[PDB]
Each structure stands twice: as C-alpha cells, then as structure tokens.
Amino acid sequence: SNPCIPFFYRADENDEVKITVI
Amino acid sequence: GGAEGFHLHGVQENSPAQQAGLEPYFDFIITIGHSRLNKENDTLKALLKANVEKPVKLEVFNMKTMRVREVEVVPSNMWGGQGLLGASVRFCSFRRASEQVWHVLDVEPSSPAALAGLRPYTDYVVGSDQILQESEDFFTLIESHEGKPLKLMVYNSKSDSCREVTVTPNAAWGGEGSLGCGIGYGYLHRIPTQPP
C-alpha cells in the first residue's frame, strides 16, 4: 500500500516524505 | 510562529486524536500548552509523553474554517493502537497550503474524468500518491500519465468528504484534452470555507 500525499507536501533532504506517528 | 505546524496526515480509529475531533488533511497542530510548535523537534512528542493520561490543550488551525481552535486531548498508552494520540503528522506550513488544490469544472460524458467519477464543480483534487517536485503541479502529473492510471485524493464540497479516485489520462479519448473536464486553479477554485 502507498500513502496519499497532499499536493503541498514536499520531499525532504533525502527525497523522502516521512510521516510520524504520535 | 508564524505559519508552520504539524499537519495532520491521518488519525487512527478509536484514538485520542479522533476522540477530540482532530480532522485529517484540514487540521494543523500549532501549539501544545503554551509551546508554539514552529520548529521540527521533539517538543510535541516529549510533552505528550510527559502528560500521558492527563488532559492537554492543543491549538489547531483548520483550512476549511480558516480559524485556530483549542482542542483538549488525553494522550494515552491504553487505547490499543500506535502512539499516544494515534495521529500521523508531518511538520509543514499552512500559509499557502490551501492554494494547492485543483477544482473540477465541467465534465464531458464518456471522458477519462467521467469514467473516473469526477463530479463537476464539487470535486477538488488535493493530493496523489505521487510526490510533486518543486515547480510541478497537478498538470505535470496529468501530462506524465498518458495512458497510465493516476491515483488522486479528492475532496467533495457537497458530501464534505474525501475519497480516492483513479483517472487514466487519454489524449486520444476522442474529445478535447486528455481528461475531458475543465480544471480551475486560483482564488475561486479552492475548497469552500465553511462558517463552522
């Protein structure tokens, strides 16, 4: 499965989009 | 503090976040107690843990109302899912965030858009499983998926709910464009702001 990414999200310094569970 | 905060990507069922009405996509957590969350550090996690099983005040900015509200949450180890709030977040800016949606206008019958179930004037495309590189936009994606399925998140203003939509752009579908719907971008083409 692969996550829905809002269009305003931008990749990180590693071309990753990490989402955190809190 | 400023325009940055923790965007609410998702919330788990039966979580403290869900219990408190934190809304995926539309909410950004911007403060906990007196602490303004304007830097990507451990403060939010650290304070939820130091207050576990106790009520904690969050301030939360919502795009659909465009207002900051206060929300009480009770972080907990006891509710059976992952995390103390049961929420998925990403440090982000809410300053221009609501600008990055694309409004479905008229939809032609038999078009790619129609086959996908895009709904005229009430659908807003808000995301994808594809990550936009800087200076890319929704049209970038349509253009690079000729004959390929593209998975989109879509918010509907009439049902007030989000759903997943798959569209296969097709320049040879017979009519104009590769979608066969109009798309709006700009001031009158964002998610309607709700009085609530």
Side-chain angles (χ1 to χ4, degrees):
Chain A
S1 199
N2 216 270
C4 161
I5 301 310
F7 287 137
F8 52 89
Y9 278 19
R10 286 294 177 279
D12 220 310
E13 309 296 338
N14 310 311
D15 258 339
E16 294 188 86
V17 177
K18 297 204 186 53
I19 287 85
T20 310
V21 173
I22 58 168
Chain B
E4 290 169 317
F6 285 92
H7 179 247
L8 201 58
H9 184 265
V11 310
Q12 286 156 73
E13 279 293 315
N14 196 339
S15 69
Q18 181 179 71
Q19 290 176 55
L22 292 188
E23 194 177 28
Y25 179 76
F26 293 107
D27 276 341
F28 294 76
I29 308 175
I30 61 172
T31 74
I32 177 172
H34 303 306
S35 194
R36 180 71 182 83
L37 303 166
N38 56 4
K39 111 187 211 191
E40 196 177 357
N41 59 26
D42 205 52
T43 294
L44 177 63
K45 285 188 73 78
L47 289 175
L48 295 162
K49 181 164 174 176
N51 290 290
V52 67
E53 307 313 327
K54 296 165 181 146
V56 159
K57 301 196 170 155
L58 305 177
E59 296 180 328
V60 181
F61 178 85
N62 184 277
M63 290 189 295
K64 219 191 316 192
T65 68
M66 279 273 145
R67 297 216 182 182
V68 167
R69 74 190 182 287
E70 184 177 273
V71 172
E72 176 173 277
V73 297
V74 183
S76 186
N77 285 312
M78 314 287 192
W79 62 280
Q82 185 180 341
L84 294 180
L85 283 209
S88 281
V89 304
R90 185 158 198 255
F91 194 70
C92 200
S93 173
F94 58 78
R95 171 193 289 124
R96 274 186 143 257
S98 74
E99 297 185 7
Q100 292 208 48
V101 305
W102 281 260
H103 183 198
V104 178
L105 309 181
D106 282 291
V107 178
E108 305 299 311
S110 310
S111 63
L115 300 186
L118 294 174
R119 304 181 195 165
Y121 293 105
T122 54
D123 275 346
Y124 294 81
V125 197
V126 303
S128 179
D129 60 355
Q130 306 293 282
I131 302 160
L132 295 178
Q133 292 207 293
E134 23 173 328
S135 84
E136 300 187 335
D137 63 20
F138 174 72
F139 295 111
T140 295
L141 287 181
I142 299 300
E143 294 171 26
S144 65
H145 287 71
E146 287 290 347
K148 294 172 168 58
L150 175 57
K151 303 238 279 163
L152 301 175
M153 192 64 76
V154 179
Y155 165 78
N156 192 269
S157 63
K158 182 174 187 296
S159 60
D160 196 23
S161 70
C162 291
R163 74 196 188 273
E164 176 195 308
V165 173
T166 303
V167 65
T168 292
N170 183 5
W173 76 274
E176 256 193 80
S178 298
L179 285 190
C181 64
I183 298 293
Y185 183 76
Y187 178 65
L188 298 180
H189 296 304
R190 308 164 184 161
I191 284 172
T193 292
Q194 287 195 358

